[PDB]
Structure 1
């Protein structure tokens, strides 16, 4: 078929989504402190890689596995819900059709919690 990545506009679309996503995440006073020690330019690059790779683009994901990145930080299920919500909101802002937003959340969310099955 066509990849989800291609369907939404390829690399540029991923960049747009990720930038808007991080605005929403870092604006959230329940989340922002988690990123106090983070190399943010590197993180955003890695997130573009993760999204692009997961949605079927040619970009390699060169980052770490999700469990090993996220563990030991005190991130709650509530925090995950907030993040997932900000992602859905960024895809909406970007103009992604709603059924494709659902598809993307369905690809990304399980991967974010180390399910690949």
Structure 2
């Protein structure tokens, strides 16, 4: 709880400052409308239950951004290993994320802050 967290004098999480759970659901719908609309990335999600993924991804980003909700998915290295995902691909994905965040009116300093929280994860997402 935001209020309870501030009662304990803990610093505001990225999760809170952008609107917690529901802000993230909304971004994630847009995000995937943008990823699935992109011809360089579409194919990747050909054999995928998107509803299941969106659910899993709301959990991951929420978790990653400071939320109290649990990730109930597979590890990042494993799911992405062998899918031929390159940095070129990682970055385009990181683009739609940002556009989606921007479109949700999230300030750019905070978008840039989320990107720098996700970026490291590339090591686990790409091949090289």
Residues 29, 116 of structure 1: CA spacing in aligned structure 2 closer, same or farther, 3 A cutoff? closer
In 1, distance between residues paired with 2:84 and 2:122? 15
In 1, distance between residues paired with 2:105 and 2:90? 23
How many correspondences in the alignment? 117
In 2, distance between residues paired with 1:116 and 1:24? 20
Q: TM-score, normalised by structure 2?
A: 0.86
**Uncovered stretches (5+) of structure 2, i.e. residues with no partner:** 1-10
State the superposition RMSD in angstroms: 2.6
Q: TM-score, normalised by structure 1?
A: 0.93
Displacement after TM superposition at 1:21 (Å): 0.4
Displacement after TM superposition at 1:111 (Å): 2.8
- Higher Cα Rg: structure 1 or 2? 2
Contact 2:15 2:67 in 1 (8 A): yes
Give the corresponding residue for 2:104: 94
